[PDB]
Design a protein. Structure first.
Length: 298
């Protein structure tokens, strides 16, 4: 114990008690646990973990070490989403206390270390919380044409006054990049009335881009996902999400392989490969690197 401890660095967690529960409108609108971690060093911070993440850790922990590993209770929680959460609290703290009580060599497991490390995203979330819990989904940006406009180049957009243009990106002061019914191009900002602006620069809300393939055209539709940008979802997550968005069910989620081939997303291991593949791709600021290509299903 004496030596056992001292050899462990100060950023090592010694206590992780839940401080709050928050509802995150992620791929699936679920709940997350606002855990407060205190380290040997004496610094206390907040991290956000969903249930699925604890479980995912246990499974990883058990695989490796094949002392006594603590396990998460068996499921019977069934009430509202919130309730099923507030209920898991006591169980959860228990898990952490135990887990952090384990021996040095298991406490220094990257996979465990990381679970407790505060992440860029975890930190973006605290300021966000204060701003609401004591103030002073989200539609993608769009505007309305105020006058007909004919593009001056192949690059400039074309539209009729009154059209609804969805903003894809800001270019400079006088121009924007938007899309209007399969058409994508840049346009003079003077020709529209902003209907819903771009998210403010410091908003930690991410977005998932979808290319919706219809019968005649093929549109682009961004969706506000409050999830870490590097997370991986479950094919069932994307399926539930993409439906409440496009208001239908016979759609196939596809993505474009690195080489260019289209790929059907049938299995979770498929999604995980998609995400794993995009991980390197040139980053857009708050846009998941992997983009879906929804198509009609026959």
């Amino acid at each position: 114990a004496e030596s056992d401890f001292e050899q462990l660095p100060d950023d090592v967690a010694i206590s992780a008690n839940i401080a709050d529960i928050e509802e995150k409108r992620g791929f699936t609108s679920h709940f997350v646990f606002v855990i407060e971690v205190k380290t040997k060093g004496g610094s206390k911070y907040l991290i956000y973990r969903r249930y699925r993440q604890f479980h995912a850790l246990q499974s990883k922990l058990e695989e490796r070490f094949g002392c006594t590993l603590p396990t998460l209770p068996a499921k019977v929680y069934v009430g509202v989403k919130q309730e099923i959460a507030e209920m898991r609290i006591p169980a959860l703290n228990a898990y952490m206390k135990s887990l952090l009580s384990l021996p040095v060599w298991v406490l220094m497991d990257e996979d465990v270390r990381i679970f407790f490390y505060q992440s860029p995203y975890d930190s973006e979330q605290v300021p966000q919380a204060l701003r609401r819990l004591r103030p002073r989904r989200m539609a993608a940006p769009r505007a309305e044409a105020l006058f007909d406009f004919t593009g001056n180049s192949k690059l400039e957009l074309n539209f009729k006054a009154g059209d609804v243009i969805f903003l894809l990106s800001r270019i400079n002061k006088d121009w924007l990049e938007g899309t209007v019914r399969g058409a994508t191009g840049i346009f003079p900002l003077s020709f529209v009335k902003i209907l819903k602006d771009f998210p403010e620069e410091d908003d930690p809300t991410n977005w998932l881009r979808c290319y919706y393939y219809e019968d005649t055209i093929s549109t682009i539709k961004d969706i506000a996902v409050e999830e870490d940008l590097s997370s991986t979802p479950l094919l069932k997550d994307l399926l539930e999400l993409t439906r409440r968005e496009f208001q239908r069910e016979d759609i196939a989620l596809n993505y474009r392989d690195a080489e260019g081939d289209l790929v059907r997303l049938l299995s979770d291991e498929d999604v995980a490969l998609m995400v794993r593949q995009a991980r390197g791709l040139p980053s857009q600021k708050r846009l998941f690197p992997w983009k879906l290509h929804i198509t009609q299903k026959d």
